[PDB]
Scaffold this active site. Structure first.
Site, PDB file in Angstrom:
ATOM      1  N   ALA A 153       0.813  -1.082   0.069  1.00  0.00           N
ATOM      2  CA  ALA A 153      -0.014  -0.059   0.063  1.00  0.00           C
ATOM      3  C   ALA A 153       0.696   1.234   0.150  1.00  0.00           C
ATOM      4  O   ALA A 153       0.954   1.889  -0.964  1.00  0.00           O
ATOM      5  CB  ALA A 153      -0.782  -0.165   1.117  1.00  0.00           C
ATOM      6  N   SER A 154       1.783   1.357   1.000  1.00  0.00           N
ATOM      7  CA  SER A 154       2.849   2.490   0.909  1.00  0.00           C
ATOM      8  C   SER A 154       4.013   2.011   0.006  1.00  0.00           C
ATOM      9  O   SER A 154       5.134   1.656   0.701  1.00  0.00           O
ATOM     10  CB  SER A 154       3.125   2.856   2.367  1.00  0.00           C
ATOM     11  N   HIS A 167      -2.260   1.762   6.321  1.00  0.00           N
ATOM     12  CA  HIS A 167      -2.769   0.436   6.686  1.00  0.00           C
ATOM     13  C   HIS A 167      -4.107   0.486   7.332  1.00  0.00           C
ATOM     14  O   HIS A 167      -4.508  -0.457   7.640  1.00  0.00           O
ATOM     15  CB  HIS A 167      -1.567  -0.573   7.418  1.00  0.00           C
ATOM     16  N   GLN A 217       3.185   4.509  10.418  1.00  0.00           N
ATOM     17  CA  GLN A 217       2.681   3.378  10.016  1.00  0.00           C
ATOM     18  C   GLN A 217       2.536   2.061  10.680  1.00  0.00           C
ATOM     19  O   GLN A 217       1.366   1.320  10.836  1.00  0.00           O
ATOM     20  CB  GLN A 217       3.149   2.884   8.796  1.00  0.00           C
ATOM     21  N   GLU A 218       3.353   1.936  11.474  1.00  0.00           N
ATOM     22  CA  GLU A 218       3.455   0.414  12.290  1.00  0.00           C
ATOM     23  C   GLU A 218       4.210   0.787  13.368  1.00  0.00           C
ATOM     24  O   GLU A 218       5.485   1.404  13.589  1.00  0.00           O
ATOM     25  CB  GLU A 218       4.643  -0.303  11.399  1.00  0.00           C
ATOM     26  N   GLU A 231      -2.363  -5.033   8.651  1.00  0.00           N
ATOM     27  CA  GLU A 231      -1.299  -6.204   9.072  1.00  0.00           C
ATOM     28  C   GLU A 231      -1.769  -6.809  10.469  1.00  0.00           C
ATOM     29  O   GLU A 231      -0.784  -7.414  11.050  1.00  0.00           O
ATOM     30  CB  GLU A 231      -0.033  -5.343   9.131  1.00  0.00           C
ATOM     31  N   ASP A 245       7.874   1.850  11.814  1.00  0.00           N
ATOM     32  CA  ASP A 245       7.897   1.910  10.535  1.00  0.00           C
ATOM     33  C   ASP A 245       7.279   3.161  10.368  1.00  0.00           C
ATOM     34  O   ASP A 245       6.076   3.127  10.071  1.00  0.00           O
ATOM     35  CB  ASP A 245       7.404   0.925   9.661  1.00  0.00           C
ATOM     36  N   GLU A 280      12.416   2.385  11.098  1.00  0.00           N
ATOM     37  CA  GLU A 280      12.602   2.170   9.403  1.00  0.00           C
ATOM     38  C   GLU A 280      11.833   3.545   8.811  1.00  0.00           C
ATOM     39  O   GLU A 280      10.838   4.019   9.278  1.00  0.00           O
ATOM     40  CB  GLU A 280      11.540   0.970   9.229  1.00  0.00           C
ATOM     41  N   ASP A 304      13.790   1.141   3.839  1.00  0.00           N
ATOM     42  CA  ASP A 304      12.677   0.488   3.115  1.00  0.00           C
ATOM     43  C   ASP A 304      12.397   1.144   1.688  1.00  0.00           C
ATOM     44  O   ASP A 304      13.057   0.842   0.816  1.00  0.00           O
ATOM     45  CB  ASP A 304      11.508   0.124   3.859  1.00  0.00           C
ATOM     46  N   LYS A 338      12.377  -6.831   0.746  1.00  0.00           N
ATOM     47  CA  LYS A 338      11.101  -7.094   0.171  1.00  0.00           C
ATOM     48  C   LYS A 338      11.249  -7.702  -1.360  1.00  0.00           C
ATOM     49  O   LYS A 338      11.410  -6.998  -2.281  1.00  0.00           O
ATOM     50  CB  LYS A 338      10.116  -6.046   0.158  1.00  0.00           C
ATOM     51  N   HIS A 350       7.337  -8.859   5.156  1.00  0.00           N
ATOM     52  CA  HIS A 350       6.095  -8.981   4.108  1.00  0.00           C
ATOM     53  C   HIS A 350       5.484  -7.762   3.479  1.00  0.00           C
ATOM     54  O   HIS A 350       6.222  -6.670   3.678  1.00  0.00           O
ATOM     55  CB  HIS A 350       4.901  -9.439   5.130  1.00  0.00           C
ATOM     56  N   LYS A 395       9.702  -9.105   9.758  1.00  0.00           N
ATOM     57  CA  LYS A 395       8.627  -8.253   9.859  1.00  0.00           C
ATOM     58  C   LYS A 395       7.494  -8.882   9.190  1.00  0.00           C
ATOM     59  O   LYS A 395       7.503  -8.789   7.971  1.00  0.00           O
ATOM     60  CB  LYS A 395       8.998  -6.690   9.377  1.00  0.00           C
TER      61      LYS A 395
HETATM   62  O1  LIG Z   1       6.196   0.446   4.353  1.00  0.00           O
HETATM   63  C1  LIG Z   1       5.883   1.114   3.109  1.00  0.00           C
HETATM   64  O2  LIG Z   1       6.141   2.519   3.015  1.00  0.00           O
HETATM   65  C2  LIG Z   1       5.231   0.613   2.016  1.00  0.00           C
HETATM   66  C3  LIG Z   1       6.549   0.769   1.161  1.00  0.00           C
HETATM   67  O3  LIG Z   1       7.769   0.065   1.648  1.00  0.00           O
HETATM   68  O4  LIG Z   1       4.981  -1.128   1.878  1.00  0.00           O
HETATM   69  P1  LIG Z   1       3.744  -1.821   2.862  1.00  0.00           P
HETATM   70  O5  LIG Z   1       2.418  -1.114   2.341  1.00  0.00           O
HETATM   71  O6  LIG Z   1       3.994  -3.350   2.252  1.00  0.00           O
HETATM   72  O7  LIG Z   1       4.171  -1.622   4.171  1.00  0.00           O
HETATM   73 MG   LIG Z   2       7.712   0.268   5.182  1.00  0.00          MG
END
Ligand SMILES: O=C(O)[C@@H](CO)OP(=O)(O)O
Ligand SMILES: [Mg+2]
Ligand SMILES: O=C(O)[C@@H](CO)OP(=O)(O)O
Ligand SMILES: O=C(O)[C@@H](CO)OP(=O)(O)O
Ligand SMILES: O=C(O)[C@@H](CO)OP(=O)(O)O
Ligand SMILES: [Mg+2]
Ligand SMILES: [Mg+2]
Ligand SMILES: [Mg+2]
Lengths: 423, 423, 423, 423
Positions: free
Chosen positions: A41-42, A154, A162-163, A204, A241, A283, A310, A335, A363, A386
């Site tokens: 997605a990102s 996500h 994001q994470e 995720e 992330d 990240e 990444d 990846k 992933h 991850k």
């Molecule tokens: O993490 C992110 O910026 C994107 C690109 O690496 O990917 P994903 O949606 O799989 O996390």
């Molecule tokens: Mg990433």
């Protein structure tokens, strides 16, 4: 003879219900193997091209073009090659395509074939995939970097990062590490319920509450760790992330928690978090082409924390080499579908490892029931993986496959533990 | 099933006519494999123990004890193990022995088994040895570091430096690199004849003239390179193995070219040579425990030349780790019989590679017709191998096996070339 | 079915770093076998032609023409023949070439194929090579004639005699014989060191000191034998390879130890040595076409010592037959690459054996890691082999293969011992 | 695996209706092979013992003891041995028996096993028997020495000489040689009919007329040769088996054609025949222990004719060696059942060949349908075989098997022709 006899592909769905590519390879010796392709997605600007059909079907996201490319061009180009000559097969795919970005056949068509050939080769040699790719010395079970609170691209919340990940570095074994991750995840659910916050999942498998920002999320996770009877840091460390390309304005700066910020102000923010939290890894703290930003950030805090490229590297030896030369990051996110072959993936891993950079097999946010990356983490002895929250079986199936690998290795297994993050 | 069914050993002779161990492993599936053990002359104090019989027979150098250890203890301990579980087998060998130095069964008994099991496993998987150990990505043909003028412990001359090496870094391919090495070697023979100097060979197939010292040898070699129509540096670079432990007095200093010298004076000498000669690599410039010497030397010239730990590291993860922590050397010499298992060898290689150190797979001065290290160099993608002059088939058989590997890889092969030595 | 399916060749290097031919044969039953070709320095005028490329590459010594002859003519000519019909294959090779000297395809191209076919046939029959060639009765381990002091064409010294050999005739077994040879070799090193003479090796692994002449060398060797605690003659006898063609002037005579001498004066010299030394064998005491010289020499001393035709016979039934008819020599040196097929080699061996001549299987001074001649000595029950000093693994690998054959024969093995030299 | 699993024996009849031993060997791989043992009438005193039952049954000539020895002792002693280790099996047989003469188990019991094991080994290796025993070089079709007029111990006539043989030395091929032998045989029948002489056959299929003596027989045969349109000598030569032990009185002399004669008078007679007839070979002209007689006879005529030791040597390396040392005979008759193993037979053949003696593979006068000796003649490249008149299929079956071998060799076959008898 592991000679390729047939190559077929079909359209399947990923963990978000979007089409993706699955490839089957059959060898003259009756070996048959199947590999599926993930989807981000990102997605970094520099990622290998994902071929999509467009039009109305599946909201433009069909992969019938990538499937027909497999059936009509790739299959005929690799039938009669030895599945064991991974590099020859991968070069044939890259030459057949003939573009820098795999924009003709698609990274998704090409990778499906690359991965199914590796699997068929491993099957034919009667070796588990980790051992075929990694050789007899492949034995390190990675620390599972588990993204248990999802934001950014996500989920549909206002959370910029994001994470938000927990890392059971203190566990004696992968099987215990996984249990610690699951116990913290279930504790965080209870914490979020008590606080009146959403336990609806993101892509995720992490809870996707609309929390006020970064420190609120990290406080909630630290409570969940304590509430599972584990110590933040020593047992369960934290990782992020930021996916900062997602909140970066070209030539402008970082729209982050209600303000536009410079690379140096973002670096200040990250340095603050290090001070306050047991963070082992960050990240994409800065954007995919912010080369000066990253160099300063790595100068400033790289001795103290793992810094993972990444979107800056997209598993691309040419972009990684540029990073190594500039002192940018100290780890590579790995990846397969950022680059589009196993060979190119393993060249990037080789380039990182030889440059003293760490490696973290990843992933995508759009996953399948494929568990290849479990075997790939053990093969390359990254000691870091991850692959999601311990929820949604597109994530759990990888953790279940790491259990089986650990079991098969017996006394030979080693859990990477805190030896994954020397800083 | 690659289940070990039989393990036998016998006494053979090495390239110097001294006894050494050969082991045969048979698997229930009818796989049969043989591996032989090399033996050093300039052996580090910290090397795994080589078990010798003593008494009159073979001047005390018999290996009938190591052979009986294989037949009576090791065989019974590993029959019924899977040959593919290299790490489990290697751990069983290490636990059976039960000493830190392998002083009970012998590194020579244990390694014979470790190596024959790997070979049987590769045979059973129907994979070439390089591909079984290295996985599908193993493709890099190493620069042959060719020791074409021998001194120190490898001849009966007054020359202090053990090994004077040429490195055909500029060749487009391994097959051309080998030809360049052979052409320079034959040119050096003619140069030595014209100068009235001995073309009698040393232990590693290099000419063993009694030349006045280091610069005389290096001048003779530079003439040989030009006389073969190649450019010193760009086509054919120089490398040394000082083996300085051989001329070091405990707690005293380095008796070198007619004087006792300090680590810093030796560093001065080496820095002079860098100034005057196209040197890409210097191995053991200082003694095996001179930790301060090496740290200063690596500080002083390590940015400018590869610095190879041999006797300082003895392919030992514990000694290598100490080096990495202290900024000692920037490369590891990889000798399987310094440590005594393939697993421990691959742990040391992993530790170097992850620490940003280069790797150079090495013969010993006492070799056999075994070509395992050819496959091992390609497997680990060292891009550097040290296996002798292109003379004496205990050296040439490894170069012939690299030809066959290059041929088998086809368009997949890459010659490491000048990308072996970034400095 | 041992039907030949594929024949490939490549250029490899010999023990001196010169190119030579290696051939691989694959049978429809999956049998795969490899054979390499040796190369002499003191080559008889009548030897089968060795095809060389000329030009700059490898100093004119490339064998890419012989390799292309294998790939493009020979392969197509023998695919579909039964590998077991050695004579049919060898006749096809000889007819394809169509010259008396194998000057079209090369003895080196043809022999590579001849030898790889024999090996494939033996593999397919699941018989060790000695037993396939020699039948079930092949059991005699040869006395190793070990050339431990090298001169003539094998070193850069003024020593006229090419080879100074020790023969452990008194040993109870091949395994003990080999140990006696190695112990004398190591003793001679110490003797040479004490005397201030070079321990630099020649081409066949013998020490290449510049000693004053024949008797000095033989004195040094007798001291080495005593110093290993063995009796000259009864335990360890002496043998020579004068290679007198190398110091013979056409129609003139023998330039030997500082004088031109007649055949009769050379005979006088040799008769003197017999008087003074425990010599069992002298090879090529006179030149390759000195038929009258040899006849007189064999009349004069042939009752007292083995007299070995090498350059006079070049493993050639037509030249051997001429010798038998004239009372020239009493033994044949057996070199496969002097004649260029296994069939022709075995015809010459048959002709010697039926004529009451002894047989001595020989290496060349340019050898490979190939151990075929070990199996060939046992197969023909020569009871004599000449394959070098117990140093340099192009020599030792043959002695190691004789160990394995002896071991495999068990109580069936017999060591030829003093029954090799009845005189 | 050619591991011996079962060994059975039975009593069969020979070509004279007397019992003899047949042995069957089965290997774990399902190989099954059968060999039968011949029996002589004019048996040397020194022959390996033939075990007979005695009593009434078959006139005392039963072999149920030899059969029970196979079933109850030998079978249990060799089951689990490798059929390919001919020498180990033969040594086990000889050690099990434990007598010098094989008087315990019987030469007939032991040889049956020795021969069936060789056959099973050849079958298992998928090699024709000639090629298993002789290796890939076995290609020489022997001159058939055809005994077409029988006397002495092989008929009930007053003719002293046992065997009057024709030798088609001038034929271009074995297939033509056989036809020449058959045409002369049929011509001799017509000659004998015209002369009113018996065409009743003797034991070896030769006509057994009561002719007046030696020269009458040889005249009748020379007429038969001319009458078939062949030239005596150049096309068809003559040979004899005097079997003089049969007409020799211990310490007395030779009762020959109506008189007692000395060795020297017999030598005179033989020298006369040489003068008058195209004789190439004379077997046992004097008695088995008349060592002085033979030495003088070989001195006197051995340069002019082949002299064959049969009863003097009994295929016994110890008796042959004594002959070679004394200048007795210049050829060995090779009878497997004179010595009792294949190994001992092949040692005697090796000793002859290395001593410059010729070799002639022989039947006994009591034969079977076994054709082993056809394969054995080609294997050892004797170029001479003695297996009867081209009549009675115990003789013809060997000639039919030589046809098949010649056919199988194709262009590789060579007919020994006049190159069998250089004198
Ligand atoms: O993490 C992110 O910026 C994107 C690109 O690496 O990917 P994903 O949606 O799989 O996390
Ligand atoms: Mg990433
Ligand atoms: O190089 C050396 O110091 C010794 C020890 O490493 O070994 P070898 O004799 O094998 O070169
Ligand atoms: O001995 C010699 O005269 C030559 C010729 O036979 O050969 P090599 O160099 O192999 O010894
Ligand atoms: O020829 C003979 O004297 C006897 C002995 O050799 O044998 P046979 O009856 O088999 O010919
Ligand atoms: Mg060293
Ligand atoms: Mg010679
Ligand atoms: Mg007879």
């Amino acid at each position: 003879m592991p000679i390729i006899e047939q190559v077929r592909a079909r359209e399947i769905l990923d963990s978000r219900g979007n089409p993706t590519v699955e490839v089957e390879v059959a060898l003259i010796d009756g070996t048959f193997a199947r590999a599926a392709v993930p989807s981000g997605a990102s997605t970094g600007e520099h990622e290998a091209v994902e071929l999509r059909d467009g039009g109305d079907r599946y909201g433009g996201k069909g992969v019938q073009k990538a499937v027909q490319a497999v059936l009509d061009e790739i299959g005929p180009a690799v039938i009669g090659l030895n599945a064991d000559d991974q590099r020859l097969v991968d070069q044939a795919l890259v030459d057949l395509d003939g573009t820098p970005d795999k924009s003709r056949l698609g990274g998704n068509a090409i990778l499906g074939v690359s991965l199914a050939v590796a699997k068929a080769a491993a099957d034919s040699a009667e070796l588990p995939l980790f051992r075929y790719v990694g050789g007899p010395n492949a034995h390190i079970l990675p620390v599972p970097m588990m993204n248990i609170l999802n934001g950014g691209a996500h989920a549909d919340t206002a959370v910029d990062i994001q994470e938000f990940m927990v890392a059971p570095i203190g566990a004696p074994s992968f099987v215990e590490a996984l249990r610690w991750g699951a116990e913290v995840y279930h504790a965080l659910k209870s914490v979020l319920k008590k606080e009146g916050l959403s336990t609806g999942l993101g892509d995720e498998g992490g809870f996707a509450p609309d929390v006020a920002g970064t420190t609120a999320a990290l406080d909630l996770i630290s409570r969940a760790i304590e509430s599972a009877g584990l110590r933040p840091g020593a047992d369960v460390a934290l990782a992020l992330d930021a996916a900062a390309t997602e909140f970066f304005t070209d030539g402008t700066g970082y729209v982050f928690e209600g303000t536009t910020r410079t690379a140096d102000q973002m670096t200040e923010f990250y340095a603050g978090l290090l001070g306050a939290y047991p963070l082992v890894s960050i990240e994409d703290p800065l954007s995919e082409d912010d080369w000066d930003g990253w160099a300063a950030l790595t100068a400033s805090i790289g001795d103290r924390v793992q810094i993972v490229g990444d979107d800056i590297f997209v598993t691309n030896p040419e972009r990684l080499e540029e990073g190594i030369e500039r002192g940018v990051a100290n780890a590579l996110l790995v990846k397969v579908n950022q680059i589009g072959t196993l060979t190119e993936t393993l060249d990037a891993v080789t380039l990182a490892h030889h440059g003293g950079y760490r490696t973290m097999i990843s992933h995508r946010s759009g996953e399948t029931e494929d568990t290849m990356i479990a075997d790939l983490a053990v093969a390359i002895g990254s000691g870091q993986i991850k692959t999601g929250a311990p929820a949604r079986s597109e994530r759990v199936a990888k953790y279940n496959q790491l259990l089986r690998i650990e079991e098969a290795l017996g006394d030979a297994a080693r859990y990477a533990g805190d030896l994954a993050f020397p800083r």
